[PDB]
Structure formats: C-alpha cells, structure tokens
C-alpha cells in the first residue's frame, strides 16, 4: 500500500474486473468475471475443500468447478458472489484495505437504478470505504480517447451499447443496448462447430472457443463471396492447436462468427446489425452534428482486439450515409484497460474530491442520496 | 436652374465626401488576422500528458 491515501480505481466491466490504485497507468489485478464452485461434495481431507474459487485459481480449476456467472448482461444473481470476489481482489490480489481509500467504480451503461441502490447499500454496510463515486463506462472510454465529441460503441461480454456524446454531454435519448455480446458469439460458434463434428457444452470448451475467436477469427469483407471462395481455400483455411494436442481446422467460420452481430437474422433478432443501431442513433439527434458523429465514432471493449471491425464499420456507414465527408475510426491499442485509465484520470484532478460520496451522506439519506449525488 | 442643380448636387456631394472620409481613415484594420491550422508534423507522439 502506498503511504498516501490515494483512491481505489476499479472497473467492474461486464466480462472483466480490473482494479488498482489511483495515479497508476494500468490496473494491477485484472481477472475474468467467471466464478467456480465445487461440482461435488466433501469426503476427502488434507487440502482444498473451499467453496468459492475466483480468478486464476478458478481458471486452473475450471474442470472440477461448475463455472457460473454472477452477472450476465447486467443482471445480478447473488450479491454474496460479488462480496467474495471483491474481498479477494482487495486483500489477496490488490493487498489493500478499503478503509483508507475511496473507491471510483465504473458500471455498465443503463444499469438498473434499483441495482445501484442495493449494491451501494450492501457495499456500505459490508465494507468500510470512506467515500464513493460510480460512473458510466461510456464517459470513461471518452476520457481515454480524450475527445468530447463522438459515439461510443461499448462491446462488453453481456451487452453492446451505442451512446452518442457531443462536446462532452450525454445523449440518453439516442442511447441503445443490444443483447448481442461475447456470449452470443460463443453460442453461434458452438452450433457451427457442432455442425463441423465437434459438440461440447461445458464452459472449458467455451473458453477454448473464445480463445479461438481471439486468435483466428476474421471479419469478412464480402460475406457470401468469401464462403464461395472458401469452399476449398486450402491457404485461406486456418487451423488451431488445442491444448490437448489435436489440430482443429476452421475455414469460413472464422469470418462467419462475428458476422452474426452484423447479420442478426442468422439466429433470429428483429434488430439489424450494430451498424444500423449506430445509424439510427445518429439520426435520432439533430441533423447538423451527425457528420461529426460520423467522423468521431469510437469503439471500446475487449472484443475490439479482433481485426476487421474498423474496415467493416466505415464501409457500411459510408454505404448508409452520404460519402462526402470522410469517416475515420479511432481505437488506441489495449483499450480494454482504457476505462480504468480514465478512472485514474478522474482521480488526477483536485476537483474530484468535491463530490466524493462520503459515509455520513449515506447514513443521513440512505441509499436514496445517490439519486441526487451522482445525477 | 443651374444654381438649383448646383445646390442640390453640392449637398449630395458633401454627404458623399463625408461618407468617404470614414473609409479613407481605415480600410483593412477592421478585419481579423490569419491563424490557419497547418504543419505541426514535428510534434511528438507520446504526449507529456495521458490524453495520448
Ligand atoms: N486480449 C484479448 N484479445 C481479444 N479479445 C479479448 C481479449 N481480452 C478479452 N477479450 C474479450 O473481451 C470480452 C470481455 O469484454 P470487456 O472488456 O470485459 O467489456 P467491457 O469493456 O464492457 O468491460 C471477453 O468475452 C473476451 O472474449
Ligand atoms: Mg466493453
């Protein structure tokens, strides 16, 4: 722990938890949001026999644990799970006590207000954090980009959000949430791999196939033409070496998996591709600034490490929108940490401690005070 | 008649000349100056601040 009473910066992103100290450039403890529990009961002795398993421990113990998600698309299952994982993060991973450091947290866009009131109340009772602040990840990604104008595409693991912000002001009237995310990607890839001869249901193979998505997946420039040329495609077809050692070969599926977000009719969504959701979002607001939105679009999330989103994005928007002004996307490398960086940025300036949510305000007005203290 | 015409046109020319005097005083110092954006290529990439 630093000698100074600097604040805690924790991004509880929908899919990854990244925690550390204020003034740091990158979060120190970063782990996926999976939680493992003992698949069977206790009869043995001498070691183990522990209920909750979180972090890399559960990653190593994936096979003998039922792998469960305490949060999915924002919905909260069991607050005890968050209690334990935050205990682990603060003491076993961050080696910090929350008594002496206020916490800045980031929440998924348009999270329930009742969810905020319950989570804040359990937090304040269970923990002894001196002060509090929670913010939407959209403005955090904006801060990471450091440009007040643009539309943020936050692609988490449970929801994809499109949020327009012009000159550093939120536009909730033109903000939308789409239920397509990593979960859907894994599902669709699971069914295609089932049609390829490999049919698995458990979560270990879920992580294997999301790793495959991280490594080999394409974003098709032209879809049906690329499957037509991918009929044989000995060179274009790509293989992976699974940890057991078998060589699993995939061809068109590499670019037929992310395409589903762009083409939701593959597995039955009324909503069109996410580019249509950015398009409608843009026109909902006044006409004039729309060009700037076209030229200032930002994309954020862990998924963004994949190739192909930028070219597809620009080409389709230019197809939909007039091609007079030039559209260009901006995306700094390793932007999944960017939100946490913005949290540090929030703690950088000396005005931030004017609106810390202190203990006594919550003791006076209950959780309801946040309704007036954040917004 | 010539006297009437001279008087009218002289008054008109007097108002015209008083109007010219203002333009004679200044003609360019009313416009703003140039500050177009250009060059800056030599600036570095890792900004001393994190808005990089
Ligand atoms: N290094 C990486 N390369 C590619 N994809 C990644 C990487 N790390 C994480 N991801 C993907 O990002 C997803 C998690 O998104 P996340 O960054 O938590 O969203 P948010 O920005 O809302 O927190 C995971 O499902 C995973 O598939
Ligand atoms: Mg995200």
């Amino acid at each position: 722990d630093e000698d100074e009473t600097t604040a805690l910066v924790c991004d509880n992103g929908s899919g990854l938890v990244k925690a550390g100290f204020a003034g740091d450039d990158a979060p120190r403890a970063v782990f996926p949001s999976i939680v493992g529990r003992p698949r069977h009961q206790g009869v043995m002795v001498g070691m183990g026999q522990k209920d909750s398993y979180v972090g890399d421990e559960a990653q190593s113990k994936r096979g003998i644990l039922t792998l469960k998600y305490p949060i999915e698309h924002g919905i909260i299952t069991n607050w005890d799970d968050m209690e334990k994982i935050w205990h682990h993060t603060f003491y076993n991973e961050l080696r910090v006590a929350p008594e002496e450091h206020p916490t800045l947290l980031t929440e998924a866009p348009l999270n329930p207000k009742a969810n905020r009131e319950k989570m804040t109340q359990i937090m304040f009772e269970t923990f002894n954090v001196p002060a509090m602040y929670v913010a939407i990840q959209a403005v955090l990604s904006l801060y990471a980009s450091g440009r007040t104008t643009g539309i943020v595409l936050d692609s988490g693991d449970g929801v994809t959000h499109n949020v327009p912000i012009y000159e550093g002001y939120a536009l909730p009237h033109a903000i939308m949430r789409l239920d397509l995310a990593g979960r859907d990607l894994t599902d669709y890839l699971m069914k295609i791999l089932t049609e390829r001869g490999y049919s698995f249901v458990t979560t270990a193979e879920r992580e294997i196939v999301r790793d495959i998505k991280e490594k080999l997946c394409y974003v098709a420039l032209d879809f049906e033409n690329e499957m037509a040329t991918a009929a044989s495609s000995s060179s274009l077809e790509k293989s992976y070496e699974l940890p057991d050692g078998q060589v699993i070969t995939i061809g068109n599926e590499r670019f037929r998996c992310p395409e589903t977000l762009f083409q939701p009719s593959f597995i039955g969504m009324e909503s069109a591709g996410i580019h249509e959701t950015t398009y409608n979002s843009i026109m909902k607001c006044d006409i004039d600034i729309r060009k700037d939105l076209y030229a200032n679009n930002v994309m954020s999330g862990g998924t963004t490490m994949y190739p192909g989103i930028a070219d597809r994005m620009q080409k389709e928007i230019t197809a939909l929108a007039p091609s007079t002004m030039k559209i260009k996307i901006i995306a700094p490398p390793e932007r999944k940490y960017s939100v946490w960086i913005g949290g540090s940025i929030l703690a950088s300036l000396s005005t931030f401690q004017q609106m810390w949510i202190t203990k006594q305000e919550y003791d006076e007005a209950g959780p309801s005070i946040v309704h007036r203290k954040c917004f | 008649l010539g006297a009437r015409a001279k008087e009218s046109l002289d008054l008109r020319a007097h108002l015209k000349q008083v109007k010219k005097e203002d333009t004679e005083k200044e003609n360019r110092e009313v416009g703003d100056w140039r500050k177009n954006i250009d060059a800056l290529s030599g600036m570095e990439g890792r900004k001393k601040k994190f808005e990089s």
Side-chain angles (χ1 to χ4, degrees):
Chain A
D1 292 334
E2 296 275 338
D3 57 348
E4 161 45 43
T5 57
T6 186
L8 297 172
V9 174
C10 301
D11 185 7
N12 296 331
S14 46
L16 274 155
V17 178
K18 310 160 271 300
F21 297 147
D24 271 348
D25 73 17
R28 303 188 317 157
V30 176
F31 60 97
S33 67
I34 297 90
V35 166
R37 263 197 190 83
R39 191 177 291 137
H40 301 74
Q41 59 84 30
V43 62
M44 290 89 61
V45 69
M47 72 304 293
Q49 284 107 25
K50 162 159 66 218
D51 173 42
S52 169
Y53 281 147
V54 327
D56 46 332
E57 304 164 16
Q59 296 320 344
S60 314
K61 298 183 200 86
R62 271 215 288 276
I64 233 56
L65 306 174
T66 63
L67 294 163
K68 160 88 163 65
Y69 300 147
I71 190 181
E72 44 291 6
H73 335 291
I75 306 162
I76 299 293
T77 65
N78 197 13
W79 295 116
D80 180 29
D81 299 346
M82 271 70 74
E83 187 282 323
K84 304 185 283 307
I85 57 177
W86 292 332
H87 210 50
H88 211 307
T89 306
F90 296 162
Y91 291 106
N92 301 116
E93 279 186 7
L94 285 196
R95 287 171 296 284
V96 76
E99 276 76 3
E100 79 259 10
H101 303 312
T103 307
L104 179 62
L105 278 165
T106 65
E107 73 167 7
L110 275 70
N111 267 5
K113 262 141 189 329
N115 215 13
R116 204 202 299 255
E117 280 207 278
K118 56 177 174 286
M119 86 163 66
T120 46
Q121 148 182 4
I122 64 159
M123 187 275 286
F124 279 136
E125 316 185 354
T126 57
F127 289 126
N128 216 358
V129 68
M132 252 340 160
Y133 203 54
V134 60
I136 202 175
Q137 293 174 280
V139 60
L140 275 296
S141 66
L142 200 149
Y143 288 156
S145 288
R147 164 182 75 156
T148 57
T149 299
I151 189 177
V152 169
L153 232 25
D154 184 6
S155 63
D157 205 9
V159 197
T160 59
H161 326 263
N162 56 335
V163 298
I165 295 96
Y166 180 77
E167 276 304 302
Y169 306 102
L171 286 189
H173 94 275
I175 288 182
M176 270 76 45
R177 300 180 82 186
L178 223 44
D179 274 330
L180 292 149
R183 211 49 174 84
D184 281 338
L185 298 166
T186 76
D187 286 326
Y188 178 76
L189 179 67
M190 250 166 231
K191 42 165 73 174
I192 315 287
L193 187 60
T194 296
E195 327 303 356
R196 264 296 284 262
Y198 301 128
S199 303
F200 318 127
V201 56
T202 46
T203 314
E205 289 93 290
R206 290 206 55 212
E207 312 296 300
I208 297 190
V209 304
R210 70 174 179 83
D211 217 350
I212 297 172
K213 208 154 202 309
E214 295 191 42
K215 291 184 183 293
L216 287 160
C217 275
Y218 218 60
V219 167
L221 297 170
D222 171 358
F223 203 41
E224 317 78 353
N225 277 86
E226 286 190 355
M227 289 75 72
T229 183
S232 58
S233 264
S234 23
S235 66
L236 289 156
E237 197 278 320
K238 294 217 216 186
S239 170
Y240 186 59
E241 159 45 10
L242 268 72
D244 59 357
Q246 348 177 161
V247 98
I248 301 308
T249 52
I250 61 184
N252 51 5
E253 312 86 1
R254 298 177 295 107
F255 38 87
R256 288 197 295 113
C257 201
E259 193 73 64
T260 310
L261 259 63
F262 309 133
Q263 302 303 307
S265 313
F266 295 153
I267 61 175
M269 286 66 82
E270 155 185 332
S271 285
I274 79 164
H275 47 296
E276 293 62 23
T277 79
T278 313
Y279 203 55
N280 58 13
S281 290
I282 296 148
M283 298 75 75
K284 282 170 102 183
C285 198
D286 70 340
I287 297 314
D288 179 2
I289 63 169
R290 284 201 279 135
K291 62 171 173 305
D292 309 339
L293 280 162
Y294 290 147
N296 300 314
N297 60 3
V298 289
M299 149 73 125
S300 184
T303 47
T304 71
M305 298 355 123
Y306 311 139
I309 323 107
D311 62 359
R312 188 55 187 242
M313 269 310 122
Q314 280 70 255
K315 70 202 164 172
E316 54 208 3
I317 314 285
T318 52
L320 297 154
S323 309
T324 76
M325 53 66 246
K326 179 197 180 167
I327 296 170
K328 152 154 99 176
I329 191 171
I330 206 62
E334 195 59 21
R335 62 206 62 112
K336 79 178 173 69
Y337 284 152
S338 279
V339 173
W340 190 98
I341 297 175
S344 181
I345 298 168
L346 286 208
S348 288
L349 213 76
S350 85
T351 44
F352 192 66
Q353 313 79 22
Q354 293 143 5
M355 73 300 295
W356 274 117
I357 298 169
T358 54
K359 278 268 185 220
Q360 69 275 16
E361 292 166 314
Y362 171 80
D363 286 335
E364 297 148 352
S368 66
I369 190 83
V370 67
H371 278 294
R372 280 81 66 187
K373 182 55 176 178
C374 289
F375 64 93
Chain B
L1 318 172
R4 210 160 59 225
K6 287 185 288 183
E7 190 182 64
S8 48
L9 275 298
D10 278 354
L11 278 155
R12 177 64 180 86
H14 289 147
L15 287 159
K16 200 44 161 171
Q17 63 86 29
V18 301
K19 296 184 287 183
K20 275 83 73 176
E21 287 146 18
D22 302 289
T23 66
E24 283 149 24
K25 280 153 206 144
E26 294 184 43
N27 196 2
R28 176 60 181 91
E29 297 73 10
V30 304
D32 178 23
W33 303 124
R34 182 157 297 149
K35 293 292 184 289
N36 198 320
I37 61 150
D38 200 347
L40 307 344
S41 189
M43 291 252 66
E44 315 77 15
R46 171 49 178 135
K47 272 73 75 183
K48 61 95 176 179
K49 193 201 182 180
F50 345 132
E51 288 188 353
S52 167

